[PDB]
Structure formats: structure tokens, C-alpha cells
Write an enzyme that holds these catalytic residues in place. Structure first.
Site, short mmCIF file in Angstrom:
data_model
loop_
_atom_site.label_atom_id
_atom_site.label_comp_id
_atom_site.label_asym_id
_atom_site.label_seq_id
_atom_site.Cartn_x
_atom_site.Cartn_y
_atom_site.Cartn_z
N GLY E 67 32.21 51.73 5.50
CA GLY E 67 32.95 51.02 6.52
C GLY E 67 33.38 51.89 7.68
O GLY E 67 32.61 52.71 8.17
N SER E 96 27.64 56.11 3.44
CA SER E 96 28.00 57.26 4.25
C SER E 96 29.43 57.73 4.02
O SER E 96 29.67 58.89 3.65
CB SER E 96 27.81 56.93 5.73
OG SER E 96 28.67 55.89 6.14
N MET E 97 30.40 56.83 4.20
CA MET E 97 31.78 57.23 3.98
C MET E 97 32.11 57.27 2.50
O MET E 97 32.92 58.10 2.07
CB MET E 97 32.72 56.27 4.71
CG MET E 97 34.20 56.51 4.44
SD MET E 97 34.71 58.23 4.60
CE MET E 97 34.58 58.44 6.37
N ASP E 170 18.86 57.35 7.54
CA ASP E 170 19.29 56.97 6.20
C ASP E 170 18.46 57.69 5.15
O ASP E 170 17.23 57.76 5.25
CB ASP E 170 19.20 55.46 6.02
CG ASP E 170 17.78 54.95 6.18
OD1 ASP E 170 16.98 55.61 6.88
OD2 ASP E 170 17.47 53.89 5.61
#
Ligand SMILES: Nc1ncnc2c1ncn2[C@@H]1O[C@H](COP(=O)(O)OP(=O)(O)OP(O)(O)=S)[C@@H](O)[C@H]1O
Ligand SMILES: Nc1ncnc2c1ncn2[C@@H]1O[C@H](COP(=O)(O)OP(=O)(O)O)[C@@H](O)[C@H]1O
Lengths: 192, 350, 168, 329, 192
Positions: E67, E96-97, E170
Site C-alpha cells: 500500500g 513491496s512495503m 517486479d
């Protein structure tokens, strides 16, 4: 959803929500956009703590992208009016209004996390109507921009001219830069 | 025989900054001696007994008032407690325990038991807790008060004298309780908030409402003077129990400046104790105003500052006392405020 | 066996009141305009005490019952004068041995009645009002000499004035 | 008569690691003796009674201080206990018996009470001692009487009393008061497992109010304003208690084998490890026998059968139990 | 709906929600997208556990598609500030986070399930306005990418050059490959 916790006391066990438990320790959370409802709720929390103890420091954690100006200025006057020192901390992000309440905390009790980020810009507005009405709303928002720069300089110590140039457009300031700018006092990297 | 003016003059030597409470107690005790002394077998008989209810902050000197009065007073005195009591044969304690404790002070003399006075502390702790769907029979709460009603009014309860050496005695003495005086007093918690709402103004949390800025700057005592029985009902006490104690005392508060008076004016002040301890050695003890001020702040920081004076004073002079016999040709000792903090050593004069 | 029962009027109120349905067809009965405490306890019966907590067996052992009215402003005035052991007469004897007389005017007793009801304590709460007024007097009376009479007016109860002392 | 400095040197032979305790007693004892010997007509009238109450950790040596003081002091000494629980006069009788029916000398004699916590408010003998400490006369049959009746009245106002007992759970009561709240935010500090919760630095801040929470009556505490804290033990103390005292277990077991024609040795490298084991049991010196006897058990079991073992040496590993003790032939 | 459970204690029986029961055992759940409200709630939970016990390890289960970045960085600094070792576990997915918070846990106390999957890419953003404002927001997001790569190398042990090439687009990492990459310590296949 909000989790429920149990606080052990001499009288007995009591169930509290996570937000109410921290409120008992003079801690208030400012999350999301600043609006009339969210701001009016924080004011009652500050006043409630004043009656319980006016000599204990208050901690205010701010993580918000900013919002309405008028809603935020009510909190600024409250922090300065009451006797307790309102400590402010920036978590995640502090936009234009979030930055104004951050620096407005008590001197020497302002902190920012090592990876936090602050953003400052000029007030935003707009109007649609006759030219006579646009001039009225334009003069009003201009006073706010001048007023917001004066108060920012008062706590940061910088000059009014420097704040005017830095607030012409969006300006991002890392956590170390905030210390050099006088916006905060230190960084709470680790517990000592 | 004791005149209220004379008894008050004696109490002033042991009490500082409390005047209203002295007048209240002097009249009652004088009447009590007169009631028991005078036979009262006249047209008017069975004189009523005005029991005393003492109210004041914690560590205000309530225990000293009863004990210091008991010291000069001939009749015996006892110091009981209300929290230990538990009604209807419960684990905590039977009400009768209070009476047997009195007899030890009276050397098991029934005539002397009616003469003596009784004191109770922490009376507010048995305030009627009002939680509707929990028990509905609060042993620690209201229930205790109901048992004390008959006790204070007057009744005779069987009490084994001396406990008995062995089963052989198996007898009990009848002790009256009508003529006995009862002094029930305790520091009530949250009482100031109750009276503020109904008496003075629209105070509280809000802006215009008066904030509690004067937490220690001003004394709440003046508010307690306007107390009435109706206010105690909201606290939890039963009206019947309050009727048994018509008289009321205020005991507003102790002040930082009063602590200085307590160390100089009273006969039993700590300064006079240590002063005589060193006078015999050919040494003099001098206390400075700066030193006293430091003691006040340290005592105020800790709880029950009035009871903490011994610790602060003893630690300061513990080291000096050890070296005073060893030292010779020392006639005076000077104490400074810095010494109280512990960063300095007291000055010595030869 | 007798003791002041608390909340019995609420139970008696429910039974004495006929009761009614809240709907249209159910009739409504206008009753219990005033509390009428004294007149309400008179209508007590054993069945009401069962709901209060008493066992019927215990009440069956006590056939007779007595309802006592609550004293009013006027009742207290008579209690201070007619009874021999009244508090007024007690202090009268307290000062008689001291060679001083005592008096209680009617204007002072009327004010005590209003203050007694204000404290919701009954007759037992009357000494609080009396001792509070004579406090100052009793403090300097033994030392005082050549005083033969003491009068307590209505103002003394409010505290505006002090009791009048006559020297003789 | 003796001064705090000189009396400290005599007590130091039997007292170790309790320096601060000596100061309280030295001043108290000297102050008490002067009160009895002074005119008592000075301006400082109604002098508060100076009584000392010892703070007793389990096996902390409280009995040693009383015996050392009692032995050093020519005045009679008595070892009373609160087990009687009503009959207090018998305690007074014991002092006179040692004193040989002398009230004068008895007046100058100090008694020490042990296990005072046993009579706490856990259920009222304490009320009886109030009349004793404040001064009263108790009937005492002299010599017990040959047959069936008089008693001797011996004053008690001027006699000193040392009331001390090992209190259980007292640290928890002080913790509630001294914690003064716990914080949750970033700026507030969070306490670790044990920083100030140790026995050391916890009793020094004790006050009379804390004892009330335990069960003690204020009248009893009012008579004993002075209080002295007692450290529990330390690694240095255990090291010295096994070597400096004459009746140490090391010397005792060494003598047990002397008659058997075998010697024993205990190096310092072994005793430091023993100290760490004693503190873990939280039993003081009294709990030391379990450690020493456990290691010796295997040795002493097969020692008679063993022959030609002139001397036995105990290495540090022996205390661990991994390696058996080495035998010297 | 949330089920209610009963925890037996010496004082008596108490009814708890499923999330509050696990909170008592130093367990926090990170579910769904990372926003200002969800992130600000977890921070209060960590602080609550610090006061209760600062010497017991905390367990953080992460199942989220990622997010906002600023909301997640407030959590990372918090985990590093407090003394307790924050154990992290990846369940289902870690974007990612979510991957940055997973690897940020205490060294040696990071685990990944046998079938979990991690995905990492570069920060996403955008702006509309004058060219002068686009240059400002571009420099800001560039600092975050540089800062996020520096910390990933610090905890993963890899070089900054390797993280820069692997985070350009990615990149999916299976559970076994995560161990070889230094991102995690082991896999909790079965209970031993
Ligand atoms: N008027 C006074 N003069 C001298 N010392 C005083 C006075 N009032 C209080 N003190 C001190 O306060 C200490 C405690 O007095 P207390 O009568 O026990 O107070 P308290 O409010 O009764 O405490 P409680 O109610 O029993 S918890 C005494 O030992 C004195 O040192
Ligand atoms: N400082 C010390 N020096 C010598 N022996 C000590 C010391 N401290 C404790 N002891 C030993 O402890 C024993 C006394 O234990 P004690 O403290 O009376 O137990 P309790 O605390 O159960 O009363 C004595 O036998 C003594 O040898």
C-alpha cells in the site's frame, strides 16, 4: 476493527479499547485528513487531560496528509492556551497543516522519526461567482497565507522572507533537514 | 474541671494551623467529662451524647490530635480501624473486637471503659459501593455501617475479660456503650468534586470553567466548611449513620510554612529532640531557614510528607552523629540547604 | 421485630396501583397523585413483603403489624417542648448546674424544623443543628462569669446573629 | 560509653558487608545509654523513645548482630520469641534470671525479639506489647516459688527493645508505591526486568506508612521510629564466611577427615562458583550445606572403601559435578 | 463477524475477541492494504506491548498486497526503535512495503511459510501540474527509492548495486529463494 485490552488495577480488571488506553496516559492520535469532526474530537481530548493533570506532558502523534486549515487552527490555539507542554511527533508524513501543528509543539519536546517526511506549501482555495466576490475571498486567503508564515517563523526561528520563498511551491524536507531548519529538536532513533 | 480555653491552649502546643477543629472538640470533651462526672439525676435525665465526625486530608494530624489529647488526658485511648471489620460472621473481623481492645488500655476495669474515648481511621473506605448487578450485599460496603448503628447508640455486649487463662473461667463481662464516646473520621476521596458541582459554580473540563490550576497553590479546605449531611448521601453513607454523628470537623490542610512551625513551636518538635541530644555533649544545633525550605520540598514530593520528616532529618545527621563523639573541641554544628540535598557536608565550628 | 425498611413504598405502590394496559382498549386509571407515604404504608399486606424478600413463614409468625407516620415540621416543634427527655430540656439542665438559665423561643424552633427536613435525617439529625449554633457560646461560657440567662433567636440559626446573653 | 568508631572495629571482626547498619545501631545504642544516664530535666522533655527495628532478609545474620552486641556488652542478654502468643512476663523473667535478680543491671539490658512478623495482623498480642514498650510493671514470681505467693515488679519504660523479624512480601508492597506509574509512549522510559526492584536500594526508601500496609499498628510503629536496612549477602561475604570464621563448614569437614588421616582442600576458584549457586537458591548462608554436601555425597560414599588416599583436592569442576575430585596418594 | 472466546483466569472467566486474545500473547495482525488508519493502529499495539514487557519477543504476521509507503515507514522506524525483537512472518503474500517490513525484523527471527510469495518493485507515484512541480515530486520519490534500497541492503546483506538492478521491475521470490537472498532466516514447515 479495534482490539480490546485489559488493564489490571487494584480495584479489579477493566476492559479498554486500544485508543482509550493510550488516552489514559496523555496520548492522542491524529490520523487521516483534518476535518471539522476529527478536529473537534481532539479538542475535547486535550481539555479532558487538562483537568486530570495540568502539569504532565502530553504526547501527540501525527500521521496525516493534511486537510482543512480552519479545522487545524483550532488545535493550534488550544495547544498554546493550555499550560501543559504539548509534545508532537511525526510518524509517516506531515503535510502543510500537519507540519504547522508539529512545529507548534513545546520547544525542546518535538521529535521526528528518522524516515519521516514533511511537506509544506501555500494555502489552497478557490471560488466561482462575480468578480466582486472573488476579490473578497482572495484577500481573505491571502491574509491566512501571511498569517501561517508568521507563526511558522516564530517557532522555527527562521525569517519571514525565507518561509515565504520556501512555501511558494511544494517543498519536501527529510528528517535530518528538519533539525537543521529548526522545525524539530531531535530524532528518536533508539530508546535510551 | 478542664476549661475549653485551657484545654485549647494546651492543644495549641501540639497542633498548628487548626483552630475550628479545636473549638468543636473542646466543647464535646468538656461536655463528656461533665456528663460522666455529674450524676444527672435531676428533672432532666439521660442527656444525649454528641458524637464527633472528623474530616480532613491524609496526614493532617488526626491521629496526633487524639493521641496528643490522650497523653495529657487521664482517661484511656485506643486506635481502631474500620477496614478490618466484616459483618455477619465473615472472614475479616467481628465488630466485638473493638471492645476487647479497649479493655487492655483500661486494665479490665468496666468503670474506666465508659470514661475512655475511641478513635477510628479510614471511615470513608467503607463508603457504600453501588454496583447494582454484582452482589447486592456489599460486606465491605453499607453492611458494615448497619452493624455500627447499635454499637454507637448504646448496648451491652459480652466480652471475655483478659481472654481467660483457660476454659476454667468461661465467663464474660457486661460493658455498657451508651456513655462511651466515638470519634469516627477518615480522609474522604473525591468529596471535593461532589460539593463543587452543587455549591460554587459551573467548574470542570471546559475553557471558561475554573481549571484545577491551584492543585497545590491553594487549599481545598475552605470548600469542606460548607459540607452538609446531604452531600455525604451521594458519597454512600446512610442517613441513619450520619444522624449518629451530628458534629463535624473540617481540618482544612497543612501548609509548607506550617511544617517550619511544626519543627520550632511544638514541644515535641524534632529540632528540640536533637538539640537536647547534643546539648549534653557540649554542642549546639543550629537550623537555618534555607535548610527548612529544602526539607519542605523533599517531604512534599513524597507521599504523606508530614510523616516523612524523620527520614529526611535522620539521613542528614546520621553521618555527622557518627563522627561527633570522635571529634573534640567542637561546640557548634551548622546545617545548610545544600547539605539537605546531599551535595554538601555540614559546617563544623571549633 | 421491627426495623426501618427501605424501598417498601415502591413495592407497595406497584401493588396498590391497580395497573393498566398501555393500548387503546385497555382502560387507564389515574392514581397515586401524591406519594402519601404515611397513608401508603397503612395499605401494606403480607403478599407485598414476599416480593421484598421476606419468607411467608416468618410473616405468618408475626400477625400484627404497625405503620408509623413520618414526622412533619409541626411534629418536631412538639417533640422539643412536651417530652421530658427533649434535647431542649437537656441543655436547660446543663446550664442550670452552671447557674445560668436557657430559653427557646418559638421563632427559633420553626427554623430548626425546616433545616431538619433539609438534611433528610429525622429527629436524630436535630442535634447537628443545635450544637452548631451554641458552639461559640459553649466555648466561652465556663470562663464567662456573672451571666444568668441565654436566649436563642431565629437569627442565630442562620448565623447572622449571636445568642443574646444577660448579665446578672 | 563506647563511641561509634571504636565499637565498629570490634563488631567488624564478626560483621562484614553491613557497614551502614553499624552506624544506625552505634548512634542508637549511644543515644539510648545517655538517655538513661542523663538528668532528664532538660528543656528537651518527652524525648521520643529510640527503638531500632531490623529489616530481616532470609538468613541475613540478624541473630549475629544481637549475639555480638550481647557478648560485647556486659549487660545481660535474652533471646525471646513471639511464638508464645500469650504470658509476656516470662520474657522479662528470662533477663532477670541471667542478671541474677538484679533490677538495676536489668534496666541497662537490651533484649532482641525475633520473628516479629509472625504476630502481624493476619487473622492481637501487639496491643499487649504497647503497654510494655511505653513502660509498665509485670508480675514475676521470683525463683518460681517452693510451693503455694508474691511477685516482683520490674519497670520497663527505660529498657530498650529490639523488635525485628523476617518479613515476607514486603518488597512487593514497596514496589507499588515507588513505581510511581509506567509509561507507554516513546519519550517515557520503560523499566527492564530488574533495575531498581532488587532488595538493595529498596529498603533505604522505606517509611513507616509502608509497614502499615503490611499489617503493623501505628502505635507499635510510633514507638520504633528508627529503622536500619540490612543487606542480604554478597559474593565477597560468602567467600569470607567460608574462610575467616572458625566454625565454617570448610574447616568442619576438614576436621571430619583429620581423624580419618585424610586432608581436604578448597581453592578460591571453587568458592566463587559456590557463591553464584547460593544466591540462586535465595536461602542465605543457611542454604549453603545443600551445595557442599551434594558434591561430597559421591565422595564420602565410596571414601571408606578407598585406600591409600592420603589427601583429597577439590577443583572448581567438582562443584559443577562434571568431573570427580582428584585423589592424592 | 468476529468470534468470541473465553479465557480462563484465576480471578474468573473473561470473554475476548479473537484478535484481542492473540494480542495478550504479543501477536499483531497486518491484514489488507497499508493505509494511514491500519498502520496507525498497529503502532499503538507495539507501544502497548513494550510497556507490558520489553524483554519478550513480539510476533508480527503479515498478509497484505502492500500500500502507501509513508504509512509503512512509520512502522519500520518503530520496530527499530523499541528494544524487543520483532519477529516477522509472511503469510500468503508480501508486496513491496510488506517485504520491507518483513525483512526489517530482528536478525535470526524472520521466517517465511513454505508456499508464501514475496514481490518487490520500485515506488509508484504520479503528479499533474506545472513542470516545476513535477521536478520537485520526482526528486522526492527518487530519494525514497534510494533510501529504500539502502535499508534493504543493510538488513539483507546484499550490495546496493544488486538491490538496484533487482528492484527496477517486479521480481517474485519463492520461499526457498528468499533464504538464499538473505531476506529471511528459515522456513517454518512443521512444528518441532
Ligand atoms: N499539628 C501537627 N503538629 C506536628 N506534627 C504534625 C501535625 N499534624 C501532623 N503532623 C505530623 O504528621 C504525622 C502523621 O499524623 P497523623 O495524625 O497520623 O496524620 P493522619 O492524617 O491522621 O494520617 P492517617 O489519617 O492516620 S493515614 C505525625 O507523626 C506528625 O509528624
Ligand atoms: N556477616 C556474617 N558473618 C558471619 N556469619 C553470618 C553472617 N551473616 C549470616 N551469618 C550466619 O547466618 C546465621 C544466622 O542466620 P539468621 O539471619 O539468624 O537466619 P534468619 O534470617 O532465618 O533468622 C548464623 O549461623 C551466622 O553464622
Amino acid at each position: 476493527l479495534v482490539p480490546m485490552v485489559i488493564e489490571q488495577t487494584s480495584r479489579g480488571e477493566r476492559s479498554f479499547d486500544i485508543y482509550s488506553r493510550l488516552l489514559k496516559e496523555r496520548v492522542i492520535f491524529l490520523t487521516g485528513q483534518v476535518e471539522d469532526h476529527m478536529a473537534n474530537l481532539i479538542v475535547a481530548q486535550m481539555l479532558f487531560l487538562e483537568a486530570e493533570n495540568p502539569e504532565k506532558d502530553i504526547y501527540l502523534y501525527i500521521n496525516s496528509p493534511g486537510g482543512v486549515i480552519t479545522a487545524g487552527m483550532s488545535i493550534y490555539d488550544t495547544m498554546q492556551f493550555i499550560k501543559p507542554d504539548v509534545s508532537t511527533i511525526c510518524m509517516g508524513q506531515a503535510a502543510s497543516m500537519g507540519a504547522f501543528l508539529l512545529t507548534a509543539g513545546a520547544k525542546g519536546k518535538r521529535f521526528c522519526l528518522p524516515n519521516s517526511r514533511v511537506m509544506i506549501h501555500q494555502p489552497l482555495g478557490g471560488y466561482q461567482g462575480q468578480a466582486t466576490d472573488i476579490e473578497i475571498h482572495a484577500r481573505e486567503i491571502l491574509k491566512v497565507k501571511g498569517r501561517m508564515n508568521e507563526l511558522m517563523a516564530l517557532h522555527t526561528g527562521q525569517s519571514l522572507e525565507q518561509i515565504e520563498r520556501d512555501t511558494e511551491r511544494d517543498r519536501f524536507l527529510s528528517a535530518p533537514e528538519a533539525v537543521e531548519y529548526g522545525l524539530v529538536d531531535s530524532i528518536l532513533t533508539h530508546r535510551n | 474541671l478542664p476549661t475549653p480555653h485551657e484545654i485549647r491552649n494546651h492543644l495549641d502546643d501540639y497542633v498548628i494551623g487548626q483552630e475550628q477543629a479545636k473549638k468543636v472538640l473542646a466543647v464535646a470533651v468538656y461536655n463528656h467529662y461533665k456528663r460522666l462526672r455529674n450524676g444527672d439525676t435531676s428533672n432532666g435525665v439521660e442527656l444525649g451524647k454528641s458524637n464527633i465526625l472528623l474530616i480532613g486530608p491524609t496526614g493532617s494530624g488526626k491521629t496526633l490530635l487524639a493521641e496528643t489529647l490522650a497523653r495529657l488526658l487521664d482517661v484511656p485511648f485506643t486506635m481502631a480501624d474500620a477496614t478490618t471489620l466484616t459483618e455477619a460472621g465473615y472472614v475479616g473481623e467481628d465488630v466485638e473486637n473493638i471492645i476487647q481492645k479497649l479493655l487492655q488500655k483500661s486494665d479490665y476495669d468496666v468503670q474506666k471503659a465508659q470514661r475512655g474515648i475511641v478513635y477510628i481511621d479510614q471511615i470513608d473506605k467503607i463508603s457504600r459501593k453501588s454496583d447494582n448487578p454484582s452482589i447486592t450485599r456489599d460486606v465491605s460496603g453499607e453492611g458494615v455501617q448497619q452493624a455500627l448503628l447499635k454499637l454507637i447508640e448504646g448496648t451491652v455486649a459480652a466480652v471475655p475479660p483478659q481472654g481467660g487463662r483457660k476454659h476454667p473461667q468461661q465467663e464474660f463481662l457486661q460493658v455498657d456503650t451508651s456513655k462511651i464516646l466515638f470519634i469516627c473520621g477518615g480522609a474522604f476521596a473525591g468529596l471535593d468534586k461532589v460539593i463543587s458541582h452543587r455549591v460554587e459554580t459551573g467548574s470542570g473540563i471546559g475553557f471558561g470553567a475554573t481549571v484545577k490550576a491551584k492543585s497545590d497553590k491553594a487549599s481545598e479546605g475552605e470548600l469542606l466548611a460548607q459540607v452538609e449531611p446531604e452531600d455525604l448521601i451521594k458519597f454512600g453513607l446512610i442517613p441513619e449513620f450520619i444522624g449518629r454523628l451530628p458534629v463535624v470537623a473540617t481540618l482544612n490542610e497543612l501548609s509548607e510554612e506550617a511544617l517550619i512551625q511544626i519543627l520550632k513551636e511544638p514541644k515535641n518538635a524534632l529540632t528540640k529532640q536533637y538539640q537536647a541530644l547534643f546539648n549534653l555533649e557540649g554542642v549546639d544545633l543550629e537550623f537555618r531557614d534555607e535548610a527548612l525550605d529544602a526539607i519542605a520540598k523533599k517531604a512534599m514530593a513524597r507521599k504523606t510528607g508530614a510523616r516523612g520528616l524523620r527520614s529526611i532529618v535522620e539521613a542528614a545527621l546520621l553521618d555527622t552523629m557518627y563522627d561527633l563523639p570522635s571529634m573534640e573541641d567542637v561546640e557548634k554544628v551548622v546545617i545548610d540547604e545544600s547539605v539537605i540535598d546531599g551535595q554538601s557536608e555540614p559546617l563544623l565550628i571549633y | 421485630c421491627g426495623g426501618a425498611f427501605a424501598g417498601l413504598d415502591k413495592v407497595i405502590s406497584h401493588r396498590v396501583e391497580t395497573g393498566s394496559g398501555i393500548g387503546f382498549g385497555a382502560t387507564v386509571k389515574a392514581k397515586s397523585d401524591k406519594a402519601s407515604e404515611g397513608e401508603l404504608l397503612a395499605q401494606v399486606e403480607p403478599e407485598d413483603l414476599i416480593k421484598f424478600g421476606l419468607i411467608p413463614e416468618f410473616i405468618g409468625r408475626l400477625p400484627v403489624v404497625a405503620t408509623l407516620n413520618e414526622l412533619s415540621e409541626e411534629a418536631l416543634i412538639q417533640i422539643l417542648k412536651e417530652p421530658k427527655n427533649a434535647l431542649t430540656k437537656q441543655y436547660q439542665a446543663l446550664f442550670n448546674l452552671e447557674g445560668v438559665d436557657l430559653e427557646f423561643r418559638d421563632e427559633a424552633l420553626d427554623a430548626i424544623a425546616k433545616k431538619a427536613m433539609a438534611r433528610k435525617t429525622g429527629a436524630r439529625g436535630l442535634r447537628s443543628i443545635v450544637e452548631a449554633a451554641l458552639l461559640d457560646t459553649m466555648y466561652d461560657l465556663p470562663s464567662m462569669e456573672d451571666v444568668e440567662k441565654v436566649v436563642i433567636d431565629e437569627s442565630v440559626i442562620d448565623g447572622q446573629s449571636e445568642p443574646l446573653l444577660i448579665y446578672g
